[PDB]
Design an enzyme around this catalytic site. Structure first.
Site, PDB file in Angstrom:
ATOM      1  N   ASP A 198      10.282  -7.900 -14.885  1.00 24.82           N
ATOM      2  CA  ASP A 198       8.982  -6.897 -14.080  1.00 24.82           C
ATOM      3  C   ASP A 198       9.098  -5.532 -14.372  1.00 24.82           C
ATOM      4  OD1 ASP A 198       8.630  -4.958 -11.420  1.00 24.82           O
ATOM      5  OD2 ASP A 198      10.204  -6.824 -11.094  1.00 24.82           O
ATOM      6  N   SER A 209       0.736  -1.056   0.172  1.00 23.07           N
ATOM      7  CA  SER A 209       0.474  -0.447   0.361  1.00 23.07           C
ATOM      8  C   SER A 209       0.085   1.175  -0.046  1.00 23.07           C
ATOM      9  CB  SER A 209      -1.152   0.116   1.502  1.00 23.07           C
ATOM     10  OG  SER A 209      -1.651  -1.092   1.163  1.00 23.07           O
TER      11      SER A 209
END
Ligand SMILES: [Zn+2]
Ligand SMILES: [Zn+2]
Lengths: 87, 336, 298
Positions: B148, B31
């Site tokens: 990624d 988060s």
């Protein structure tokens, strides 16, 4: 019927399966489904705890587990970053 | 609203350290909140950072407790040591408790990438790729493979032209060393060639692919390199540049859903759909492992084209042709 | 989060049925493969004897891999402690046949995951190829062999008694070996639920003669089987009840593990079978014959 499979020239190495028929449902001949991308396909009508190696469905449930609680009080893996932070 | 109270309850220290401003994003791996980072907070500690070289808002990265200590530590250490300049996100501090942890990474204003994805001149894309590929060259100088690569992984701001990497938990290094001190009917095997049915005829014979190969397969679907798709046991560096090529193919094409794939076999079928299964089988064979695509339907050669040519000719899937990051930079992108 | 390879028994038990919200509920039973394997994995990875604080089974698996052992002795009582397996206990008691294979596959996958996720060593082919097995040994209390009913067939039970006799090793066929008496082409056939399907035609394209397949006895592959005669000693004895002796069947590694006069406690499956009236005919008797199949011996 048609299909696809990748494998090893020696076959000592296990292969990769892609048994696929564009007409899956009858596995003989059909047209409704497709495995390949459609140029216009917007849609228009036209967890697992590695820290405690146990499956779960909601996070809060896993917290109360005895195994999860035991690790929390165990503070012996925190030396790594603290060593770098103080530097 | 509830975020401030819950974070204060879990971590009383931040209640006195920072007054959380608001939340700016929610990731599948963590988060992100934005906090007013003005306590004593020596400006030297907060200096020489891609933002303005001063002390100001710092995003707080709440890392999910589920992630492994080793993974989080590798991330938080490669933030500290190998990333401190060259258009990269630097980290100054982190707050830890018995279970949960937060990183203190200076906030970088940005905007959603789906807003300016079809109404931006060519020069903006040129400078975007310039920044990305410079960062990529620095990363390879460090010797790590990002592995990624996706739009969210690199935050960008057009107002200031700012660009910084994020969401790079899957960064790892190559082998970095290679040692060579020395050097009729039998069963369901009859299915097509023997190799097709060797697996079925015996009882789950062997198991090598997922047991003794086991390679690496991590990242996002649709951005993997052919070597990764084929699960090869050796890949050197070019996955990142292949992902960059996928990105530039996406940006040259004004259509939001580039790929709907969610499976390895489906992605390979998509690659065969776009590019000839003939050359796909050629590449798979020359990589050192077999390939056989007998699917009758949809076998005709695929549409190849039906600036564009020069941008489309840089997709070479074998390690004997493609060039480095500065080599791609050499192509004209820097008018004045 | 681990690697998996299906077993032949699992594939055989594959055929599912509907009416279970997970799908994949084996007809006649209530077992669900996914839930059973998940619960077994969770219990294996998290259980302490409550030395009572350490991971009880993780070590046992570690020494198993280190030494090369292939048999895990499972105290069926333990499953009642953990909250998840409170139902797996009854499932194991009622449907041992499928459950044992499920646990065996789960154990092999657990071993592979344990060895791989920690990067100990790269020599995993031997364990990947070898077999594993699990033996329950602490089934709940029983009431004596006399008190079981016909409905208790194919359940898991335990007995105590005294060994009296043991028949010599009996060879049991598993793979039959046929030859074609006109082209020397040889075939192998695997037994299926006790029936061998003899070929009716040579499968060669050049040679297609009908009824040319003969059986070569010495070329087959056989297993080990033994029968034990046991004098049971039940704890509770009703009025005016006298003993008899029971027949136990032991297979594979357990043969020759008992000697007459030994006092033992066995855990096995309750069976039934019909018997041919005479060798000449192929008629059977309505009244069935009962025996036991040994799965663990203490
Ligand atoms: Zn946990
Ligand atoms: Zn023949």
């Amino acid at each position: 019927y048609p299909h696809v499979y990748l494998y090893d020239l020696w076959q000592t190495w296990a292969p990769i399966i892609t048994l696929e028929w564009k007409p899956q449902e009858l596995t003989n001949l059909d047209e409704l489904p497709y495995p390949i991308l459609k140029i216009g396909s917007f849609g228009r009508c036209p967890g697992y705890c590695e820290n405690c190696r146990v499956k779960y469905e909601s996070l809060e449930q896993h917290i109360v587990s005895e195994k999860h609680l035991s690790f929390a009080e165990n503070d012996l893996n925190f030396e790594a970053i603290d060593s770098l932070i103080e530097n | 609203k509830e975020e401030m109270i819950q974070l204060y309850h879990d971590l009383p220290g931040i209640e006195n350290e920072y007054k959380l401003i608001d939340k700016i994003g929610e990731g599948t791996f963590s988060s992100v909140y934005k906090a007013k980072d003005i306590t004593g907070k020596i400006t030297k500690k907060f200096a020489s950072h891609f933002w303005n070289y001063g002390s100001n808002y710092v995003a707080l990265k709440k890392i999910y407790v589920t992630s492994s200590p080793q993974r989080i530590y590798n991330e938080l250490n490669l933030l500290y040591i190998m990333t401190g300049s060259s258009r990269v996100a630097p980290l100054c501090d982190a707050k830890r408790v018995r279970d949960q942890v937060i990183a203190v990474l200076p906030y970088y204003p940005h905007e959603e990438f789906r807003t300016f994805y079809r109404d931006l001149p060519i020069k903006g894309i040129k400078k975007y790729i310039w920044e990305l590929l410079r960062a990529l060259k620095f990363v390879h100088s460090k010797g790590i493979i990002h592995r990624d690569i996706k739009p969210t992984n690199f935050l960008f701001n057009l107002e200031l032209g700012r660009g910084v990497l994020v969401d790079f938990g899957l960064a790892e290094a190559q082998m970095d060393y290679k040692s060579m001190i020395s050097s009729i009917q039998n069963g369901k095997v009859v299915h097509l060639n023997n190799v097709n049915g060797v697996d079925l005829t015996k009882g789950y014979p062997k198991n090598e692919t997922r047991r003794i190969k086991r390679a690496n397969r991590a990242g996002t679907r649709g951005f993997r390199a052919p070597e990764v798709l084929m699960k090869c046991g050796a890949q050197s560096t070019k996955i990142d540049i292949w992902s960059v090529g996928v990105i530039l193919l996406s940006l040259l094409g004004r259509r939001f859903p580039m790929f709907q794939s969610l499976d390895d076999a489906d992605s390979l079928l998509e690659l065969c759909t776009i590019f000839g299964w003939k050359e796909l089988r050629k590449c798979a064979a020359l990589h050192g492992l077999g390939f056989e695509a007998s699917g009758l339907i949809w076998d005709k050669p695929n549409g190849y084209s039906n600036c564009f040519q020069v941008l489309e000719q840089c997709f070479e899937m074998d390690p004997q042709k493609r060039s480095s990051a500065e080599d791609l930079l050499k192509t004209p992108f820097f008018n004045e | 989060r681990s690697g998996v390879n299906t077993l032949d028994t699992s594939s055989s038990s594959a055929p599912p049925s509907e009416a279970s919200e997970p799908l994949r509920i084996i007809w006649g039973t209530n077992v669900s493969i996914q839930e059973c394997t998940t619960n077994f994995r969770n219990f294996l990875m998290s259980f302490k004897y409550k030395t009572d604080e350490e991971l009880y089974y993780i070590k046992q698996l570690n020494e198993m891999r280190e030494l090369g052992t292939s048999n895990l002795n499972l105290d069926a009582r333990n499953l009642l402690a953990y909250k998840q397996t409170e139902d797996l206990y009854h499932q194991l008691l009622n449907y041992p046949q499928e459950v044992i294979s499920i646990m065996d596959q789960t154990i092999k996958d657990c071993m592979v995951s344990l060895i791989v996720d920690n990067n100990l060593d790269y020599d995993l082919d031997e364990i990947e190829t070898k077999f594993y097995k699990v033996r329950p040994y602490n089934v709940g209390s029983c009431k004596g062999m006399r008190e079981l009913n016909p409905n208790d067939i194919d359940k898991l039970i335990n007995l105590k008694g005294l060994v009296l006799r043991s028949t010599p090793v009996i060879p049991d066929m598993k793979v039959a070996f046929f030859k074609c008496n006109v082209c020397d082409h040889t075939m192998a056939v695997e037994i299926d639920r006790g029936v061998i399907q003899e070929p009716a035609r040579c499968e060669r394209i050049d040679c297609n003669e009908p009824n040319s397949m003969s059986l070569i006895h010495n070329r087959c592959s056989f297993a080990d089987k033994q029968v034990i005669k046991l004098q049971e000693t039940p704890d509770f004895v009703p009025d005016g009840q006298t003993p008899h002796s029971i027949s136990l069947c032991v297979y594979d590694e357990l043969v020759d593990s008992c000697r007459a006069g030994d006092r033992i406690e066995v855990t096995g499956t309750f069976r039934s079978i019909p018997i041919r009236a005479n060798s000449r005919q192929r008629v059977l008797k309505s009244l069935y014959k009962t025996y036991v199949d040994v799965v663990h011996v203490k």
